[PDB]
Amino acid sequence: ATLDSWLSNEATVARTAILNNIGADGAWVSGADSGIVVASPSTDNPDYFYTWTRDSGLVIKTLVDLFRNGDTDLLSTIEHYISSQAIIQGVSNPSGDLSSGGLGEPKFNVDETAYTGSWGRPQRDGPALRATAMIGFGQWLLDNGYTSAATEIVWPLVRNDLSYVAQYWNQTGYDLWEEVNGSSFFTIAVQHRALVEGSAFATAVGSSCSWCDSQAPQILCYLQSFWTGSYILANFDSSRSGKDTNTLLGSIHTFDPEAGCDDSTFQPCSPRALANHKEVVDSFRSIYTLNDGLSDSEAVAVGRYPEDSYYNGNPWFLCTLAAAEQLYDALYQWDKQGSLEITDVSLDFFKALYSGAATGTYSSSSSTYSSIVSAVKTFADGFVSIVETHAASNGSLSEQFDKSDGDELSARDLTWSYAALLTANNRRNSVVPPSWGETSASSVPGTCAATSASGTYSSVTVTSWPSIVA
Numbered sequence: 001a002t003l004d005s006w007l008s009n010e011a012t013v014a015r016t017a018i019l020n021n022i023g024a025d026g027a028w029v030s031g032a033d034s035g036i037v038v039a040s041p042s043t044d045n046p047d048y049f050y051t052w053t054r055d056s057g058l059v060i061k062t063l064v065d066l067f068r069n070g071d072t073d074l075l076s077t078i079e080h081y082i083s084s085q086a087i088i089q090g091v092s093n094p095s096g097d098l099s100s101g102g103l104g105e106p107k108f109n110v111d112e113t114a115y116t117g118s119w120g121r122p123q124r125d126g127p128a129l130r131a132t133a134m135i136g137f138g139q140w141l142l143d144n145g146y147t148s149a150a151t152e153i154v155w156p157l158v159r160n161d162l163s164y165v166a167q168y169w170n171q172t173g174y175d176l177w178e179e180v181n182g183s184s185f186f187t188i189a190v191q192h193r194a195l196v197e198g199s200a201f202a203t204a205v206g207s208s209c210s211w212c213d214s215q216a217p218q219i220l221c222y223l224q225s226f227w228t229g230s231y232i233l234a235n236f237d238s239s240r241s242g243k244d245t246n247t248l249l250g251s252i253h254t255f256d257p258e259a260g261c262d263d264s265t266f267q268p269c270s271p272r273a274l275a276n277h278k279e280v281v282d283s284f285r286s287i288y289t290l291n292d293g294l295s296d297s298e299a300v301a302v303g304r305y306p307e308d309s310y311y312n313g314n315p316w317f318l319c320t321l322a323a324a325e326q327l328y329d330a331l332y333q334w335d336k337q338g339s340l341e342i343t344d345v346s347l348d349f350f351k352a353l354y355s356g357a358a359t360g361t362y363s364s365s366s367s368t369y370s371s372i373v374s375a376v377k378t379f380a381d382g383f384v385s386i387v388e389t390h391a392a393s394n395g396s397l398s399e400q401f402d403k404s405d406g407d408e409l410s411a412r413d414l415t416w417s418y419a420a421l422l423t424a425n426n427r428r429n430s431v432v433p434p435s436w437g438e439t440s441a442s443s444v445p446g447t448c449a450a451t452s453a454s455g456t457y458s459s460v461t462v463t464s465w466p467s468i469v470a
C-alpha cells in the first residue's frame with residue numbers, strides 16, 4: 001500500500017537525482033566534465049565534489065541495467081562515461097600512470113585532473129567495478145550489432161582494468177570505506193567477478209584474457225579465508241570485529257540470478273551469506289536509539305560497521321538498502337530453484353523469523369516454505385520502510401540518517417544512495433541483472449597460491465562514437 005507506492009515514486013526521483021549529478025549537463029554539478037559521475041554536489045562539510053572510480057562504476061552499472069531493460073534515453077550518459085574513462089585511465093596521479101599503478105587511484109577532480117593531496121590509496125576495487133560496468137555495455141553493443149564499438153572502444157578499456165586486477169589482487173590497499181589498509185572482502189569478491197566476466201567478454205570480441213583465466217581461480221581460493229565459521233570477515237589486518245555491511249555489498253554486487261545458493265561465491269541465499277546477514281544486522285540493534293524496542297524479527301536501521309565513529313557512527317541509506325536487497329535476491333533464487341534449504345549454519349537466520357524453523361529441504365509447495373518466504377519478504381520490506389521514513393519529503397537521499405532522531409546528515413543527494421534505491425527496488429520486483437558466469441566459476445582450487453599475472457597496458461583514444469540507435 002504505502003511502500004509499493006512510495007517505491008515507484010522514489011524510483012523516479014532516484015533516476016533524476018542521478019542524472020543531476022553527472023556532467024556536463026547535470027543540474028547539480030556544474031564544473032564536472034562530460035560523463036563524470038559526482039559523488040554528491042556537496043562541496044563543503046563534507047566535500048564530496050569529486051569523482052570516485054568505485055562510485056561511478058556502481059552507478060553506471062545500474063544505468064546500463066536500466067538501459068538494457070528499455071531506458072534507452074540513458075545511451076548518451078553511458079557513452080560519455082566510457083569516453084571520460086579513456087581519459088582518466090591515462091591521467092598520471094599519486095598511484096602512478098596507466099601502466100604503473102595509476103588505475104588504482106580512488107578519486108579525481110570533477111574536471112578530470114588528479115587529486116594530489118593525501119588519501120587512502122590505492123583502492124583495488126575501482127578497476128574491477130569500472131570493467132564490470134563497461135562489459136555490461138559491451139555485451140549490449142555485441143548483441144545489437146555494434147561489433148566495432150565493442151572491439152575497438154570497450155574491450156581495450158576493459159583490458160587495462162583487467163590487467164591491473166590480475167597483477168595486484170594479492171597486495172593490500174584500502175577498503176571501500178577508505179580507512180583500513182589491508183585485504184577486504186568486497187574487493188576480492190568484485191575482483192573475482194570482473195576477471196570471469198572479463199574473460200568471457202574477451203572471447204566474445206575474438207581476443208583472449210589469459211591473465212583473467214589463471215588468476216580468477218586463485219582469487220576465489222583466497223576469498224574462502226574470509227569465512228570465520230560464523231560470519232564473513234570484512235578485512236584482514238584490522239582490529240575490529242569484522243562485521244561490516246562491506247560483506248552484504250560484496251554479495252549483492254556479485255549476485256548471479258543463474259546461481260544456486262553457492263557458499264564458495266557467497267551468493268545471497270548461500271547459508272554463509274544468510275548467517276552473515278544475521279550477524280551484521282544484529283550488530284546495530286542495541287547501538288542505535290532508533291532501534292530501541294524492535295525485536296529480532298523486525299528490521300532495523302543499518303550502518304557500515306558497529307565500530308564506526310564517522311559523524312558519530314549512524315545508519316546509512318545504502319547499508320539499510322543492502323540488507324533488504326540481499327533478501328530480495330535470496331527470495332528470487334529460492335523461487336527459481338523451487339526449494340529452500342535450512343542448514344545448521346543458517347538455522348539462526350531462519351529461526352529468528354520463523355520459530356518452527358528446522359534443518360531440511362523445503363519445496364516451494366510446502367507449508368514451511370510458504371511461511372518462511374512471507375516472513376523474509378516482510379523483513380526485507382521492513383528495511384525499505386525505514387528508508388522511506390527518513391527520506392526528505394521530496395525524496396532526497398543523504399549519506400546517513402541520525403542514530404537518534406533519524407534526521408539526514410553528512411553528504412546530501414548522495415548518488416550512491418540513489419543507485420542503491422534503484423537496485424533494491426528492481427530486485428523487489430524480480431528485475432535481475434544479466435548473469436556473469438558464476439555457474440562455471442565457483443569451483444575452489446585444492447591449494448591457494450599467493451600469485452599474480454601481468455597483462456598488458458595500452459592507452460585508448462576515443463576519436464568518435466558510431467551512430468548507435470536504441
Ligand SMILES: *[C@@H]1O[C@H](CO)[C@@H](O[C@@H]2O[C@H](CO)[C@@H](O[C@@H]3O[C@H](CO[C@H]4O[C@H](CO)[C@@H](O)[C@H](O[C@H]5O[C@H](CO)[C@@H](O)[C@H](O)[C@@H]5O)[C@@H]4O)[C@@H](O)[C@H](O[C@H]4O[C@H](CO)[C@@H](O)[C@H](O)[C@@H]4O[C@H]4O[C@H](CO)[C@@H](O)[C@H](O)[C@@H]4O[C@H]4O[C@H](CO)[C@@H](O)[C@H](O)[C@@H]4O)[C@@H]3O)[C@H](O)[C@H]2NC(C)=O)[C@H](O)[C@H]1NC(C)=O
Nearest residue numbers: 028029030031041042043045394395396408409410411412
Ligand atoms: C529536495 O529539497 C531539498 C531542500 O531544498 C533540495 O536540496 C537543496 O538543493 C539546493 C540545490 O538545488 C542546495 O543548494 C546548495 O546549497 C549550498 C549550501 O549548502 C549548505 O548551506 C545550506 C543553507 O544554509 C544548507 O541547507 C546545506 O545543507 C545541506 O547540505 C549539507 C551538506 O552536504 C547536509 O549535511 C545537510 O543535511 C543539507 O542536506 C549546506 O549546509 C550552496 O553552496 C550551493 O551553491 C552552489 O550551487 C549553486 C547552484 O546549484 C551555485 O549558484 C552556487 O554558486 C554554488 O556553486 C558552487 O558549487 C556547485 C556544487 O554544489 C558547483 O557546481 C559550482 O560550480 C560552484 O562550485 C565552485 O565553488 C566550490 C566552493 O567550495 C568549489 O568547490 C568548486 O570547485 C567551484 O569552484 C547550493 O546553493 C541546498 O543546499 C539543498 N538543501 C538541503 C536542505 O539539502 C533537494 O535537492 C531536493 N531534492 C530533490 C530530489 O529534488
Ligand SMILES: *[C@@H]1O[C@H](CO)[C@@H](O[C@@H]2O[C@H](CO)[C@@H](O[C@@H]3O[C@H](CO)[C@@H](O)[C@H](O[C@H]4O[C@H](CO)[C@@H](O)[C@H](O)[C@@H]4O[C@H]4O[C@H](CO)[C@@H](O)[C@H](O)[C@@H]4O)[C@@H]3O)[C@H](O)[C@H]2NC(C)=O)[C@H](O)[C@H]1NC(C)=O
Nearest residue numbers: 169170171172183222225227228235236237238448449450
Ligand atoms: C595473497 O594470497 C595468499 C594465498 O591465498 C593469502 O594467504 C592466505 O592468507 C589467509 C589470511 O592470512 C590465511 O588464512 C589464515 O590462516 C591461519 C591458519 O593457517 C588462521 O589462523 C587465520 O585466521 C585469521 O582469519 C580467520 C578467517 O580465516 C579468522 O577466523 C581468525 O580470527 C583470524 O583472523 C584474525 O587474525 C587475522 C590475521 O590473519 C587478522 O588480520 C584478522 O583481522 C582477524 O583479527 C587465517 O584463516 C591463509 O592461510 C593464507 N593462505 C596460504 C596458502 O598461505 C595472502 O593473505 C594474500 N595476501 C593479500 C595481501 O592479498
Ligand SMILES: *[C@H]1O[C@H](CO)[C@@H](O)[C@H](O)[C@@H]1O
Nearest residue numbers: 262438439440441442443
Ligand atoms: C559454481 O561453478 C562451479 C564450476 O566452476 C560448479 O561446479 C558449481 O556447481 C557452481 O555452479
Ligand SMILES: *[C@H]1O[C@H](CO)[C@@H](O)[C@H](O)[C@@H]1O
Nearest residue numbers: 217441442443444445446
Ligand atoms: C573446479 O574448477 C576449478 C577452476 O579451474 C579447479 O581449479 C578446481 O580444482 C575444480 O576442479
Ligand SMILES: *[C@H]1O[C@H](CO)[C@@H](O)[C@H](O)[C@@H]1O
Nearest residue numbers: 214448449450451452453
Ligand atoms: C604466482 O605463483 C603461481 C604459482 O605458484 C605462478 O604460476 C604464477 O605465474 C605466479 O608466479
Ligand SMILES: *[C@H]1O[C@H](CO)[C@@H](O)[C@H](O)[C@@H]1O
Nearest residue numbers: 167168450451452453454
Ligand atoms: C604479479 O606479481 C607476481 C608475484 O607474485 C609476479 O611474479 C608477476 O610477474 C606479476 O608482476
Ligand SMILES: *[C@H]1O[C@H](CO)[C@@H](O)[C@H](O)[C@@H]1O
Nearest residue numbers: 099167453454455456457
Ligand atoms: C607486467 O609485466 C609485463 C612483463 O614484464 C608487462 O608487459 C606488463 O606491462 C606488466 O608490467
Ligand SMILES: *[C@H]1O[C@H](CO)[C@@H](O)[C@H](O)[C@@H]1O
Nearest residue numbers: 159454455456457458459
Ligand atoms: C600488451 O599487449 C597488448 C595487446 O596485445 C599490446 O598492445 C601492448 O602494447 C602490450 O604489448
Ligand SMILES: *[C@H]1O[C@H](CO)[C@@H](O)[C@H](O)[C@@H]1O
Nearest residue numbers: 152156457458459460461
Ligand atoms: C595499445 O592498444 C590501444 C588500443 O588498441 C592503442 O590505442 C594503442 O595505440 C596501442 O596499440
Ligand SMILES: *[C@H]1O[C@H](CO)[C@@H](O)[C@H](O)[C@@H]1O
Nearest residue numbers: 086087089090091459460
Ligand atoms: C591513454 O594514455 C595517454 C597517456 O599516456 C593519454 O594521452 C590518452 O588520452 C589515454 O588516456
Ligand SMILES: *[C@H]1O[C@H](CO)[C@@H](O)[C@H](O)[C@@H]1O
Nearest residue numbers: 090458459460461462463
Ligand atoms: C589513443 O590514440 C592516440 C593516437 O591516435 C594517442 O595519442 C593516445 O595516447 C592513445 O593511444
Ligand SMILES: *[C@H]1O[C@H](CO)[C@@H](O)[C@H](O)[C@@H]1O
Nearest residue numbers: 152153460461462463464
Ligand atoms: C581516432 O583514433 C583512435 C585511436 O588512434 C581510433 O581508435 C579511432 O578509430 C579513430 O581513428
